[PDB]
Amino acid sequence: GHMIKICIAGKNNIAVNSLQFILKNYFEADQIVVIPNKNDKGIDSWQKSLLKFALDNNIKIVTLDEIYNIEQIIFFSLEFDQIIKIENFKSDRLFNIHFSALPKYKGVFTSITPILNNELESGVTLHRIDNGIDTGNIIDQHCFPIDINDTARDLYFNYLKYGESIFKKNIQTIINNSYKDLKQTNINSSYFSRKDINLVHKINFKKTSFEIHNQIRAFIFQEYQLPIINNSKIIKSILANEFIGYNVFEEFENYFIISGIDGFKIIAQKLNK
Amino acid sequence: GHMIKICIAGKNNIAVNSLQFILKNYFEADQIVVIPNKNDKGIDSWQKSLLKFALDNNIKIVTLDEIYNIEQIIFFSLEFDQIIKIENFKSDRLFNIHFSALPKYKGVFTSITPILNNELESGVTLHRIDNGIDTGNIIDQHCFPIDINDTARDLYFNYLKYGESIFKKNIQTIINNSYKDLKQTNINSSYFSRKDINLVHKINFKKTSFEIHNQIRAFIFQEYQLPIINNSKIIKSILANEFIGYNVFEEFENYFIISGIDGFKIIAQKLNKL
Ligand SMILES: Cc1cn([C@H]2C[C@H](O)[C@@H](COP(=O)(O)OP(=O)(O)O[C@H]3O[C@H](C)[C@H](O)[C@H](N)[C@H]3O)O2)c(=O)[nH]c1=O
Ligand SMILES: Cc1cn([C@H]2C[C@H](O)[C@@H](COP(=O)(O)OP(=O)(O)O[C@H]3O[C@H](C)[C@H](O)[C@H](N)[C@H]3O)O2)c(=O)[nH]c1=O
Ligand SMILES: Nc1nc(=O)c2c([nH]1)NC[C@@H](CNc1ccc(C(=O)N[C@@H](CCC(=O)O)C(=O)O)cc1)N2C=O
Ligand SMILES: Nc1nc(=O)c2c([nH]1)NC[C@@H](CNc1ccc(C(=O)N[C@@H](CCC(=O)O)C(=O)O)cc1)N2C=O
Ligand SMILES: [Cl-]
Ligand SMILES: [Cl-]
């Protein structure tokens, strides 16, 4: 087989830390190639750059076209931005870690969609890549709570952490082609595309307190946007069991007090800016 | 105490059958009043008419304003259409059976909302009425499956059946005032108003087969409406485990074959099929 054993394709700390773990434990630089996402700027920001780590560690940056004909290569997507077509590849060893508890929440924006749909838990799922979006057979899953006042940003940093851990847990069996998998069910399968989510959320206040709270915190991801109430950005929502009456809305300098149709207290904290 | 011991307010098979049960087992006609819903024409149709049953059985028809001052009355809403204010009422014996597994799916259209939100089960919940919509303390609940090919209509007939049953199961304790209840949680609570549901549903096909199928079947309730695909009304959707390829969409004389982003076979039957 080839000098090249593995391609890491993707971004952010899950890709960089999983590549570092490969380089330290399994494969040398000359055995690895990397495909960064289109938007990788080659510098560290609020996540580390895959492109930078690869270049710093003498790992070649390649395109998809450059790896299709490499026999037996392991292709591993860690937040990769391109939909692949399996028949382009000689190898069938194609894997992804998806940031949801599949079969739920296929597609994109998976730090927003579980919260917006009232879930109490999410997960990370290692699966085979097939020609659909997050549809391939499941190899391993780790489910974890969405705590009641977690935001989309908090959820995303949990995916990063648990995704890195499920990679480390399973990578030796992927290298040895000794893993087991199971086809996904039709029932419970759900999917959201970019068009399904308006990133400038307009809150429906004719909803339960849990729903209004979930609407707010699903959009709290400051690196991208914060939800806005009367022209103030909200940085945190806090839901309590305290009944304060139905349909409360009051604005204060630093926060809003809100309740929905069931009357439980929400404190929506304004960004201190 | 007053002559009148109980009011049955509301409509359909659950109101009529529960009233019939009360009359057979607990109370006489001259101890009962009814408030039908505003739309009750007194005609048995695909549901029985509470107005007709009361007239046929010599049970007085009343307004809310006529029972507010009645001491100790049991007020039972069985699909009643009016939001009451509890302070209007001398009595605190105010009960509803809600067609969902509370705390989820408060509000309206509850034969549509759980299917549209991808649930595998629903339920009926007996609770105290408080000033909010379906927010009062839960007395009893029975959960049951939404079978994979059930329509909104099929789910409504299960609410009527399990609702009548939970009424019969609990009425002794309401009559003796010995029942127990528990406040609803804030978490998992959800609510839909009339405005949240467009009854002329436009299907989003960039979804999984389970989601496309739920979109179709949640709107199948023929006395009201049927979903329309390519200018054809749909009477049934059937979701299979069979993979047929991603994003299939083919129109035939009597049905559509459809799959979503995960490729599982849906058969959407046209109303015109013989
Ligand atoms: C772009 C963007 C993201 N976010 C949040 C929610 C997203 O879930 C989270 C991560 O955004 P993202 O674009 O990195 O990823 P997601 O949209 O979560 O995941 C998709 O895109 C990745 C690049 C992969 O292709 C993955 N297979 C896809 O599911 O950041 C915003 O809140 N506003 C935004 O404008
Ligand atoms: C009116 C209407 C109803 N439906 C279906 C879905 C509904 O869940 C089901 C029953 O309709 P409905 O109007 O009788 O009842 P729902 O909307 O289910 O229940 C509300 O209205 C009742 C009269 C009570 O006030 C109850 N407390 C409310 O939750 O029929 C339609 O599909 N299209 C429609 O246009
Ligand atoms: N075939 C394949 N299956 C996958 O499960 C998979 C890959 N490739 N490659 C890596 C990654 C890519 N994930 C994604 C997910 C969505 C979009 C995307 O652009 N979605 C568009 C809809 C595209 C369409 O309808 O064709 C959107 O607007 O949401 C891109 C990459 N991945 C698994 O993570
Ligand atoms: N106080 C009270 N609580 C209840 O839970 C209850 C009652 N009354 N009365 C009987 C019945 C009434 N159920 C309902 C539910 C919704 C609407 C309704 O018209 N909803 C409007 C929004 C109402 C609003 O915003 O104030 C809508 O457009 O959906 C009417 C009656 N019921 C429980 O079953
Ligand atoms: Cl990206
Ligand atoms: Cl090969």
Side-chain angles (χ1 to χ4, degrees):
Chain A
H2 207 273
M3 194 183 330
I4 299 307
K5 297 281 186 261
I6 190 162
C7 172
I8 298 304
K11 71 170 174 181
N12 291 353
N13 288 351
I14 179 168
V16 171
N17 295 347
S18 295
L19 173 59
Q20 183 164 230
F21 183 80
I22 289 298
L23 181 77
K24 159 177 189 204
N25 294 292
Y26 285 110
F27 296 125
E28 298 287 284
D30 287 349
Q31 296 177 296
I32 308 164
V33 297
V34 159
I35 309 176
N37 283 4
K38 215 224 191 339
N39 69 345
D40 192 327
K41 299 305 175 80
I43 61 148
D44 298 335
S45 177
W46 59 274
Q47 297 282 295
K48 292 183 288 192
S49 169
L50 185 67
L51 169 60
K52 181 184 186 294
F53 185 91
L55 290 171
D56 289 351
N57 286 278
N58 196 42
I59 295 166
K60 194 178 176 178
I61 305 302
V62 299
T63 65
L64 283 173
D65 285 336
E66 293 166 334
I67 67 170
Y68 287 151
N69 297 319
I70 303 182
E71 281 185 31
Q72 289 294 107
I73 197 177
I74 298 160
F75 177 77
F76 220 119
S77 161
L78 302 173
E79 297 311 284
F80 190 48
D81 61 357
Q82 303 186 63
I83 287 285
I84 65 163
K85 311 174 176 77
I86 66 174
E87 296 88 350
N88 275 325
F89 287 80
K90 187 167 302 180
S91 183
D92 66 350
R93 311 169 69 182
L94 318 176
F95 307 100
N96 177 247
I97 290 166
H98 182 71
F99 293 176
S100 76
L102 289 175
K104 293 183 153 188
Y105 309 106
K106 300 179 167 68
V108 302
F109 295 138
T110 69
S111 299
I112 300 182
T113 55
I115 293 178
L116 181 61
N117 290 279
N118 309 306
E119 300 289 350
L120 306 183
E121 47 188 298
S122 194
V124 297
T125 307
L126 172 61
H127 67 91
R128 301 188 62 176
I129 298 176
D130 68 14
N131 277 336
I133 299 174
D134 310 318
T135 41
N137 285 18
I138 292 176
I139 304 168
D140 195 18
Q141 181 170 89
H142 180 68
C143 296
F144 61 85
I146 303 171
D147 283 341
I148 191 54
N149 301 317
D150 280 349
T151 62
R153 186 178 189 279
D154 297 322
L155 178 51
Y156 189 73
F157 278 76
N158 283 330
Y159 290 145
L160 295 169
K161 171 169 85 181
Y162 293 119
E164 174 183 339
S165 288
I166 206 166
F167 181 90
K168 290 175 181 174
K169 175 179 181 285
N170 287 277
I171 186 60
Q172 186 163 11
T173 62
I174 299 290
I175 299 167
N176 289 344
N177 207 49
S178 52
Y179 66 88
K180 289 164 193 176
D181 68 46
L182 293 170
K183 62 187 182 35
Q184 288 188 57
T185 64
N186 58 349
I187 61 163
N188 296 309
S189 181
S190 59
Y191 168 86
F192 295 82
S193 64
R194 303 272 185 205
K195 88 183 173 299
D196 285 327
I197 297 290
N198 187 338
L199 288 162
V200 184
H201 187 63
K202 184 167 156 34
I203 298 159
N204 186 356
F205 289 88
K206 295 281 193 32
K207 289 296 205 176
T208 68
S209 294
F210 178 69
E211 287 167 316
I212 290 175
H213 173 71
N214 290 346
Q215 291 177 69
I216 297 167
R217 69 204 178 109
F219 291 89
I220 293 169
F221 199 144
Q222 185 175 11
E223 290 75 7
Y224 293 106
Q225 73 289 303
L226 297 173
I228 292 164
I229 300 182
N230 287 356
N231 311 306
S232 295
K233 292 176 179 174
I234 307 303
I235 188 55
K236 182 72 174 180
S237 184
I238 300 294
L239 174 71
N241 261 295
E242 180 175 358
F243 181 86
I244 56 158
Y246 308 117
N247 310 304
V248 175
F249 182 89
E250 187 156 16
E251 185 173 3
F252 298 83
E253 180 148 30
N254 292 329
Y255 57 88
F256 302 77
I257 301 292
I258 302 168
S259 65
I261 72 86
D262 58 349
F264 302 103
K265 187 184 183 181
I266 299 166
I267 303 161
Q269 300 187 308
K270 297 173 170 176
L271 182 62
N272 290 341
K273 267 180 291 151
Chain B
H2 207 280
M3 270 309 282
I4 299 312
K5 306 203 101 141
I6 188 156
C7 182
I8 296 312
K11 73 172 175 182
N12 289 352
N13 295 349
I14 185 174
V16 170
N17 296 345
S18 295
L19 177 49
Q20 196 170 45
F21 187 77
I22 279 325
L23 191 68
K24 169 176 200 56
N25 292 284
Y26 291 104
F27 294 98
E28 311 252 40
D30 56 12
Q31 298 186 291
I32 305 168
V33 290
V34 155
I35 312 182
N37 285 12
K38 210 198 171 259
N39 71 331
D40 197 332
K41 299 160 55 73
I43 303 295
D44 291 335
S45 60
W46 61 277
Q47 290 290 296
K48 294 195 285 198
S49 161
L50 186 68
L51 174 56
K52 173 180 153 63
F53 183 97
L55 297 170
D56 295 352
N57 288 271
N58 194 30
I59 296 169
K60 186 148 100 261
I61 295 349
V62 298
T63 62
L64 278 174
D65 256 85
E66 181 161 14
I67 73 173
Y68 286 149
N69 76 11
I70 296 172
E71 192 168 287
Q72 285 297 96
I73 203 178
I74 298 160
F75 174 86
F76 230 115
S77 161
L78 297 168
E79 298 310 288
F80 190 43
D81 62 353
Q82 296 195 56
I83 288 297
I84 58 163
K85 303 180 176 73
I86 76 179
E87 286 83 1
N88 270 329
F89 271 83
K90 170 177 278 90
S91 192
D92 67 346
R93 313 167 79 181
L94 323 179
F95 311 97
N96 178 247
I97 292 171
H98 180 74
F99 285 179
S100 81
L102 289 172
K104 288 185 166 187
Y105 309 103
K106 296 176 170 76
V108 302
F109 294 139
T110 66
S111 294
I112 304 181
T113 58
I115 294 176
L116 187 64
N117 286 277
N118 308 309
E119 302 285 353
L120 302 182
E121 50 184 301
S122 193
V124 293
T125 306
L126 172 60
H127 64 91
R128 300 191 60 174
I129 296 179
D130 72 17
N131 282 331
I133 300 174
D134 301 325
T135 43
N137 285 24
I138 288 171
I139 300 173
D140 194 16
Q141 180 170 88
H142 179 65
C143 296
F144 61 84
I146 302 174
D147 284 342
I148 190 60
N149 303 316
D150 281 350
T151 65
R153 190 177 193 279
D154 295 326
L155 174 53
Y156 188 74
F157 276 81
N158 282 335
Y159 288 141
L160 291 172
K161 171 169 73 172
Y162 287 117
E164 176 178 342
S165 182
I166 207 169
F167 181 91
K168 295 174 171 167
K169 184 179 178 286
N170 284 274
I171 189 51
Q172 178 73 89
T173 58
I174 291 213
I175 279 154
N176 75 188
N177 205 50
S178 52
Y179 68 89
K180 293 175 187 160
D181 69 52
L182 194 54
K183 74 188 184 171
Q184 288 189 56
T185 67
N186 57 344
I187 62 151
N188 297 307
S189 188
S190 63
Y191 165 90
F192 298 81
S193 67
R194 300 273 180 209
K195 269 202 150 204
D196 285 327
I197 299 290
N198 186 344
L199 288 171
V200 183
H201 184 68
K202 179 181 153 47
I203 291 158
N204 180 347
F205 291 89
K206 299 213 159 268
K207 285 294 193 173
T208 60
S209 297
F210 180 62
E211 289 168 312
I212 290 171
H213 170 71
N214 288 349
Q215 290 176 73
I216 291 166
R217 72 206 179 104
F219 291 90
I220 295 172
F221 200 139
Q222 185 173 10
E223 293 81 2
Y224 297 103
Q225 81 286 305
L226 297 178
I228 297 167
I229 300 180
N230 275 12
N231 287 310
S232 306
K233 294 187 181 182
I234 308 296
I235 188 61
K236 184 66 174 180
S237 184
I238 302 286
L239 174 69
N241 287 335
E242 179 185 345
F243 185 91
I244 59 163
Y246 304 114
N247 312 306
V248 176
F249 185 86
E250 299 293 342
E251 183 172 4
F252 299 85
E253 273 192 54
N254 292 320
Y255 57 80
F256 299 81
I257 305 287
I258 301 171
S259 71
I261 71 86
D262 56 354
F264 301 105
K265 186 191 194 182
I266 299 163
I267 304 169
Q269 304 186 295
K270 297 179 178 177
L271 183 66
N272 64 251
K273 183 177 202 287
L274 300 183

